[PDB]
Structure formats: structure tokens, C-alpha cells
């Protein structure tokens, strides 16, 4: 019970990667950053709305909903090259 199947896509190139539970954002992010060699951002798109992965809270919510949905199987994540977005602070709460 520890092998999540995640599908990553970069510039049209798709790849199949498995992650043994518990799946941590640090482990996943560290792998993506090393493979591509850059701080890429993960975007979780459900269908109608888009969620940005900033912390574990975002990933935890995404996995919780995905697991709840028996219909769903793989994870749809979009990789983007967003290394430092200008010199400022963006906080909303």
C-alpha cells in the first residue's frame, strides 16, 4: 500500500514516476528539481479550477481528494519554470 503513480509532463514530454507512501512534497519536489535542474512549480488542475502547490498543505489536500475518488488513478501535474517571480512579497490571507 505504498506506490502512487504520478504522470509528469514537460514541453509535451510525458513521464511515469512512482512514489512510495507516504508521499512527501520535499521528496517529490527534490526529485523534479534535480531531474530538470531548476526550481519548477507544480500546478494541480482538477477540471474547472486550478490549484498551485506552495506547501505540503496543498499536496495533502490534493492527495486526500484523489484517494477519495475511486474513479481517479494517476495524478495530473503541470511542470513550469518559475524561478523567482520578481523582487517582492506576495501574501494573501
Amino acid at each position: 500500500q505504498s506506490d502512487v503513480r504520478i504522470k509528469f509532463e514537460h514541453n509535451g514530454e510525458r513521464r511515469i514516476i512512482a512514489f512510495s507512501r507516504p508521499v512527501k512534497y520535499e521528496d517529490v519536489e527534490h526529485k523534479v528539481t534535480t531531474v530538470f535542474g531548476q526550481p519548477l512549480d507544480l500546478h494541480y488542475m482538477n477540471n474547472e479550477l486550478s490549484i498551485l502547490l506552495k506547501n505540503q498543505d496543498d499536496l495533502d489536500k490534493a492527495i486526500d481528494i484523489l484517494d477519495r475518488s475511486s474513479s481517479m488513478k494517476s495524478l495530473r501535474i503541470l511542470l513550469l519554470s518559475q524561478d523567482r517571480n520578481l523582487e517582492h512579497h506576495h501574501h494573501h490571507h
Side-chain angles (χ1 to χ4, degrees):
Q1 274 186 318
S2 60
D3 58 323
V4 189
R5 213 176 269 91
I6 311 88
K7 268 156 139 192
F8 289 100
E9 191 184 308
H10 206 211
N11 240 239
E13 181 101 67
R14 295 97 182 284
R15 293 194 82 266
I16 309 136
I17 310 166
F19 276 130
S20 180
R21 295 198 172 168
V23 62
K24 256 150 127 268
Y25 182 88
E26 274 135 74
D27 266 32
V28 185
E29 199 243 303
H30 276 44
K31 186 131 218 139
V32 187
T33 305
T34 303
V35 182
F36 296 134
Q38 278 177 259
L40 272 91
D41 237 43
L42 311 163
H43 282 211
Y44 220 86
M45 295 111 101
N46 208 282
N47 234 114
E48 310 154 64
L49 209 69
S50 177
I51 312 297
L52 198 149
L53 262 158
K54 268 287 100 98
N55 51 27
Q56 182 137 77
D57 288 73
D58 292 305
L59 199 73
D60 216 59
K61 193 172 260 155
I63 306 152
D64 200 300
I65 307 153
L66 187 93
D67 197 273
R68 268 269 284 189
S69 185
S70 68
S71 306
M72 269 148 121
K73 291 151 72 140
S74 222
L75 284 80
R76 291 191 142 287
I77 311 171
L78 216 70
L79 315 145
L80 315 103
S81 38
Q82 242 272 289
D83 52 288
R84 220 161 142 80
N85 190 52
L86 265 298
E87 260 80 40
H88 221 211
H89 207 37
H90 275 75
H91 256 207
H92 261 33
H93 196 84

